Structure 1
Amino acid sequence: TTALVCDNGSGLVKAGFAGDDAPRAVFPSIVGRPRHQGVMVGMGQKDSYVGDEAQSKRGILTLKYPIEHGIITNWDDMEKIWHHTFYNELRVAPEEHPTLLTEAPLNPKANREKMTQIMFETFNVPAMYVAIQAVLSLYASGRTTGIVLDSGDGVTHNVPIYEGYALPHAIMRLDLAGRDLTDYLMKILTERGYSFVTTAEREIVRDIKEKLCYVALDFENEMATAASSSSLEKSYELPDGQVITIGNERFRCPETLFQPSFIGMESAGIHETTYNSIMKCDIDIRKDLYANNVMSGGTTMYPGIADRMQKEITALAPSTMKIKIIAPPERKYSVWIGGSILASLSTFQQMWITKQEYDEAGPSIVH
């Protein structure tokens, strides 16, 4: 049997077998219990709706993302995510396949152990391994050097890798993008009188965060032309018939990635965390970290990136240095195409942690 790559998204959990095209299942991670009393008599209602069904049944449930700030809320809901994914999307039994699971870089111990341990006893997989989402994006882009960005709602990361070794002393985790950008967009859309305070309605905010937002070339000059009469406004239509016109806030929300002072948080922008991680690496290596700046994750899919990022880095970086920023299409599925390449390779079959070895070793094998 065929191995299964299942990505523990922050979004947007992604699932598909090993090779060779695209993921089979992608869905918004949400679990939602019903906040109102039923009067139908069937009864016909589920105890907890997962996505996609919880995104079709908005407004009668209370949506709860099971992974928040890069860590799982409880494994009771997480197990339901897994069960739903394997059985009613992929249509496969875990006993049939070796699996490949993903994690986030700088995640607290003992949450990789507890995960691995529960998943082996609950789903009875014959072998498993847990890879960080950032490393996998190297394979997806066909690179062997560069700084890797796993940016999902709501934890971004900046990991530098050099042919083909990782540098522990320069790894940066920012809790900045993207769920706090969702919350910030909701705070500056209230300023235009649209009240979307409720949990369900927050998903609609997320959808306009995808579609209508853009990044400026320079903030001050976009603000200048905003003061002018020329329309930057785009009109969105809402499920109850309402028409929302956003303009100024449209470029304000993504600009936060370069200026976190908009949220009021002390942390520095992607601009400077890129530079400061490069300048924590040895002198000879710095040469090839420039021009292997590879963006990844769905929250980097705004149009004005990477050429904003490019212009800003080129201004702070040493003169006459070659800087190219690598941003392909499909960054949301980058991780999955990474994992797919990995699990197909020899000899990594023998790098998987198998059940008998796990049973003897216990949680200490993980690291």
Structure 2
Amino acid sequence: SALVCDNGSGMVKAGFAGDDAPRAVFPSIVGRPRHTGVMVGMGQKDSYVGDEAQSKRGILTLRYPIEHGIVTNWDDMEKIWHHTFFNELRVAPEEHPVLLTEAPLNPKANREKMTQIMFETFNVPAMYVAIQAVLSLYASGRTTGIVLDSGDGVTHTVPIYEGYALPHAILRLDLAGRDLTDYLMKILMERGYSFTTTAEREIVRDIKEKLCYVALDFEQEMATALSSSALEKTYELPDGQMITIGNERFRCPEVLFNPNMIGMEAVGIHDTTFNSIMKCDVDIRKDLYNNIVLSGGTTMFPGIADRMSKEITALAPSAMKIKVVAPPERKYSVWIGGSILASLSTFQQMWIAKSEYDESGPSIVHRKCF
């Protein structure tokens, strides 16, 4: 009798509690139809959401509600919530308690307004919200350590001790899988092709999801690519065309590793992780080294864990051993963390009752959220 769902900047997921996978996951997009004449279509709706928006994107104008893990609008956000509850899930919002994710270090005003929208327009019985990173960590069973929540839109290096995140140690970076899509498009253009529309963006992200490579030394990788053409792998098109792929496969995470190729003036992922652990006190640094996880949609690249291991060892003192994990299903680890947290007898104690909102304003509730 519980529901859990995400706030992903893209490809948002939703499902019940105590399950191995979300019930339904769909792009987090809302859009309205433009004003025209003869409706050439059947079964039209008010404002299509998610998969319907993807299917009929050519006849819609759409606005993404959540940017870099932070939701800009609120009307679009509640539209998404309505769509999830009443189309994909067919569930009563008044009935079940609901658990919701939360981007690390969000403004108190944003959190409190989000809770009040959850509770007033929906009249939910008892709603709770937790940070995505803690759930992602708990997904791998680990209770302390560093988490590289490198999701779509935003990346967050977050360490955890005592089972809860460290506020002052949290670091933020706006590197994104969408940024990687832009990099892949640019690379494919100087290879020479035509990719400018949103359908072409969809094709590009499909290509990158199907094919990518993470290796150790980009110099020797490029040398091998220019010498031999065996790794020059082919890929289909929706129409009968065949496009062959080279160095861009290795370039897909090179921009992740060194933001200078995109000119972000930031540092690499390994650099950010090392900076975060240095911000951490020297006591639990060995345990944080032993507990390294990669949770996020972008953390699915093949052979990335070993590269992060090499980089952190190189930039770390040699005296202590590291340990980086790579769960088989890292994308949904937030959903699994939410589900396992919900399916706990003691967790029912930390719910936020409707009566509490009735008796007091949500400020003390934002305090209680811990």
Q: How far does the alpha carbon of each residue in 1:118-158 deviate from its partner, in whole angstroms, 9 at most, with x for none?
A: 12111110111110100012221111111112221110111
Deviation at 1:296, TM superposition (A): 0.5
Alpha-carbon distance in 1 for matches of 2:101, 2:194: 36
Shift of 1:223: 1.3
Segments of 5+ residues of structure 2 without an aligned counterpart are none
Cα distance in 2 between the residues matched to 1:19 and 1:78: 25
> CA offsets per residue over residues 218-269 of structure 1, 9 Å max, x none?
1111111122132332222222433322211221121111100011011111
- Of stretches 57-66 and 3-12 in structure 1, the one that deviates more from structure 2 is 57-66
* Distance (whole Å) between structure 1 residues aligned to residue 199 and residue 113 of structure 2: 31
SS, match of residue 317 in structure 2: coil
Matches of 1:142 and 1:229, distance apart in 2: 43
1:12 aligns with 2:11: yes
Cα 1:235–1:306 change in 2 (3 A) is same
Q: Cα deviations across residues 246-305 of structure 1 (Å, max 9, x unaligned)?
A: 211221121111100011011111111111111122222111111101110111000021
- Relative to structure 1, the CA distance from residue 166 to residue 72 in structure 2 (aligned partners, 3 Å threshold; closer, same or farther) is closer
CA gap 1:107/1:183 in 2 versus in 1, 3 angstroms: farther
From the superposition, tell whether residues 70 and 166 of structure 1 become closer, same or farther in structure 2 (CA, over 3 Å): closer
Contact residue 134 and residue 165 of structure 2 kept, 8 A: no
Q: How far apart are the structure 1 equivalents of 2:61 and 2:186?
A: 20
d(CA) in 1 for partners of 2:349 and 2:361?
18
SS at match of 2:263: coil
SS in 1 for 2:283: helix
Contact 2:134 2:164 in 1 (8 A): no
- The CA deviation at 1:41 is 5.3
Contact 2:7/2:66 (8 A) holds in 1: no
Following the alignment from structure 1 to structure 2, what is the Cα–Cα distance between the partners of residues 305 and 230? 23
Q: Is the 8 A contact 1:217 1:304 kept in 2?
A: no
The CA deviation at 1:15 is: 0.9
Counterpart-to-counterpart distance in 1, 2:227 and 2:36: 51
Moved more, 305-314 or 231-240: 231-240
Is 1:127 aligned to residue 122 of structure 2?
no
- 1:357 aligns with 356
Does 1:201 pair with 2:173?
Answer: no
Unaligned runs of 5+ in 1: none
How far apart are residue 320 of structure 1 and its match?
3.8
Q: Secondary structure at the match of 1:123?
A: coil
**CA distance in structure 2 between the aligned counterparts of 1:63 and 1:304, rounded to whole angstroms:** 36
Q: Determine what percentage of the aligned residue pairs are the same residue.
A: 90
1:62–1:199 CA contact under 8 A, matched in 2: no
Measured at CA, do residues 359 and 336 of structure 1 come closer, stay the same or move farther in structure 2, by a change above 3 Å?
same
Q: Would the alpha carbon gap of residues 232 and 26 (structure 1) be closer, same or farther in structure 2, given more than 3 Å must change?
A: same
Q: Are the counterparts in 2 of residues 59 and 200 from structure 1 also a CA contact under 8 Å?
A: no
Q: 2: distance between equivalents of 1:316 and 1:335?
A: 29
* Residue 341 of structure 1, CA deviation: 1.3
Compare 234-243 and 318-327 and name the one that shifted more.
234-243
Distance 1:234 1:53, change over 3 A: farther
Contact 2:118 2:127 (C-alpha < 8 Å) held by counterparts: no
CA pair 73-163 structure 1, distance change in 2 beyond 3 A: closer
1:316-367 Cα offsets, whole Å, 9 max, x none, are 2111421110111111110111111111223221211111211332231342
Please give the secondary structure, in 1, of the residue aligned with 2:253: helix
TM-score, length-normalised on structure 2? 0.93
Q: Structure 1 residues 308, 12: CA separation in 2 closer, same or farther (over 3 Å shift)? A: same
> How far is 1:49 from its partner?
2.1
Give the deviation of 1:116 after TM superposition. 1.0
**Taking structure 1 as reference, are residues 235 and 108 closer, same or farther at Cα in structure 2, changes over 3 Å only?**
farther
In structure 2, C-alpha distance between the alignment counterparts of 1:150 and 1:160, rounded to whole Å: 10
Deviates more, 1:135-144 or 1:37-46: 37-46
**Distance change >3 Å, CA 38–CA 232, structure 1 → 2:** farther
What is the rounded CA distance, in whole Å, between the counterparts of 2:185 and 2:60 in structure 1?
Answer: 20
> In the TM superposition, what is the alpha-carbon distance from 1:100 to its structure 2 partner?
0.3
Partner Cα separation in structure 2 for residue 185 and residue 138 of structure 1? 30
Q: Do the aligned partners of residues 190 and 39 (structure 1) sit closer, same or farther apart at CA in structure 2, a change above 3 Å counting?
A: farther
Contact 1:63 1:199 in 2 (8 A): no
In 2: Cα distance, 1:262 partner to 1:335 partner = 30
SS in 1 for 2:199: helix
CA distance in 2, matches of 1:164, 1:42: 53
> How far apart are 1:165 and its partner, in Å?
4.4
Q: Are the equivalent residues in 1 in contact too, given 2:18–2:343 (CA < 8 A)? A: yes
Shift of 1:109: 3.9
Do 1:154 and 1:179's aligned partners in 2 also have CA atoms closer than 8 Å? yes
Cα 1:34–1:166 shift into 2, 3 Å: closer
